[PDB]
Design a protein around this ligand. Structure first.
Ligand code: CA
Ligand code: CA
Ligand code: CA
Ligand code: CA
Ligand code: MG
Ligand code: MG
Lengths: 146, 18
């Protein structure tokens, strides 16, 4: 079940999308965050994304709606679709490898400014085969490793 | 990308840990 800490973590995600902190995520706000992740959804695509979480159909996502969806996806521990989605967030050029620059770009837009050493450390730890980049197999491990 | 974002933030929390 949801713990106080878990709700706080989910709130950290919610806050990233709810830019003006008015308690609801709008089409406009989602567009902004999506673009910051390297995506470029149309108005229709954004509305569809909101629709999947907007249980009462008022056109926006509130915290309870967000929590319900996030909690549901977390209980499905065997799911890999969200990991694949995260990989696509990083892999901007679609070459199947996350470069140090690609890792840094996402972290920067998530509000985490990292030094070159920090970025290289993150890559090194996940880079099992040592080729300097993180492939999908390595990514699954860095996203699920305890 | 709501959950994917959380997974990345979760990863960062882990990185900061040990
Ligand atoms: Ca808002
Ligand atoms: Ca709603
Ligand atoms: Ca790439
Ligand atoms: Ca590698
Ligand atoms: Mg997609
Ligand atoms: Mg290899």
């Amino acid at each position: 079940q949801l713990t106080e800490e878990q709700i706080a973590e989910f709130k950290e995600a919610f806050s990233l999308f709810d830019k003006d902190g008015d308690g609801t995520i709008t089409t406009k706000e989602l567009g902004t965050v999506m673009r910051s992740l390297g995506q470029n959804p149309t108005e229709a695509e954004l509305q569809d994304m909101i629709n999947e979480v907007d249980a009462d159909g008022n056109g926006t996502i509130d915290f309870p709606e967000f929590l319900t969806m996030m909690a549901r996806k977390m209980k499905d521990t065997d799911s890999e679709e969200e990991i694949r989605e995260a990989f696509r967030v990083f892999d901007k050029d679609g070459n199947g490898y996350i470069s140090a620059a690609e890792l840094r770009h996402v972290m920067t837009n998530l509000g985490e400014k990292l030094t070159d050493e920090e970025v290289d450390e993150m890559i090194r730890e996940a880079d099992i085969d040592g080729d300097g980049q993180v492939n999908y197999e390595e990514f699954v491990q860095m996203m699920t490793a305890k | 990308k709501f959950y994917a974002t959380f997974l990345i933030q979760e990863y960062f929390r882990k990185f900061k840990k040990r």
